[PDB]
């Protein structure tokens, strides 16, 4: 099937041989993420933008049918996005574009730990073109949610301050 | 109604600022209690968030140590690809740049 070997019987002797030798599209590729980190090129940051927008849309519409079991791969995929941005260190241009699209619709705790780390990596825009689009909603939920979301925003905006 | 609401908004902010400036800090009727009821409530709430904030600031340096390891590894893989790309730039300089078309036909 998939390298399922039959030398296991020989792998008595072949395990002795191991002991004898002892004695006598790009997010899930850390070795390739360094390439996109170094190329701020046009057809690759766009080949990648269109994948992120259509993965954060389709798999977030996936919430509207499960919202419980799909809420663990989306969390674990947004974690990979978050890690890729922490490494590559610039906010993916679909990470903000998904945020402005999905912040007004957003609740307080739906992937809060991931959404409010996405806000950290938002390409410094003007704070006159990003304030009404995003920060007018990170106040619409900031002032209506509990402390445990409140502390998760001034922390989110704390990391946003460093990343700006 | 947008304008008819903006006018009443400025009219109401005016009243609220003229009433806040009227509000002298009213500490004279403060509390007849010796304030132990409010004190040992406020320290107890402090006990409620101090365990609740040590539990968060312990995860803070947990994730900061984990990320220090992670970003040290990222910096290592970055200086490697930095020295490698610099030596590639220096080597590809005047090694493949010295390529003649007729020499390329002679190699063929």
């Amino acid at each position: 099937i998939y390298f399922k070997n039959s030398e296991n019987l020989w792998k008595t002797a072949l395990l002795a041989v191991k002991q004898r030798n002892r004695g006598p599209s790009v997010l899930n590729n850390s070795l390739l993420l360094h390439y996109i980190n170094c190329v701020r090129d046009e057809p690759v940051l766009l080949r990648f933008y269109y994948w992120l927008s259509q993965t954060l849309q389709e798999e977030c519409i996936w919430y509207k049918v499960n919202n419980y079991e799909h809420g663990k791969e989306f969390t674990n995929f947004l974690d990979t996005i978050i890690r890729a941005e922490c490494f590559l260190q610039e906010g993916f241009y679909s990470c903000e574009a998904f945020l402005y699209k999905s912040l007004p619709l957003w609740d307080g705790l739906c992937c809060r730990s991931q959404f409010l780390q996405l806000v950290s990596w938002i390409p410094f825009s003007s704070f006159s073109e990003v304030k009404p689009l995003l920060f007018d909603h990170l106040a619409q939920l900031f002032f209506t949610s509990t402390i445990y979301f409140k502390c998760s925003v001034l922390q989110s905006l704390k990391e946003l301050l460093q990343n700006w | 109604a947008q304008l008819s609401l903006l006018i009443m908004q400025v009219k109401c902010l005016t009243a609220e600022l003229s009433q806040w400036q009227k509000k002298t800090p009213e500490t004279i009727p403060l509390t007849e209690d010796v304030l132990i009821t409010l004190g040992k409530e406020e320290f107890q709430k402090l006990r409620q968030d101090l365990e609740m904030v040590l539990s968060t600031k312990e995860s803070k340096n947990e994730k900061l140590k984990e990320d220090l390891e992670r970003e040290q590894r990222w910096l290592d893989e970055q200086q490697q690809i930095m020295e490698s790309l610099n030596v590639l730039h220096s080597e590809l300089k005047n090694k493949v740049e010295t390529f003649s078309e007729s020499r390329i036909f002679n190699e063929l």
Binding site: L109, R112, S113, Q114, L116, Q117, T146, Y148, F149, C151, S152, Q155, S156 | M52, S55, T56, S59, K60, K63
Partner: peptide, 12 residues
Amino acid sequence: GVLAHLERLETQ
């Protein structure tokens, strides 16, 4: 992180 943690004091 303190965001993944702040999502588990909301519950706990």
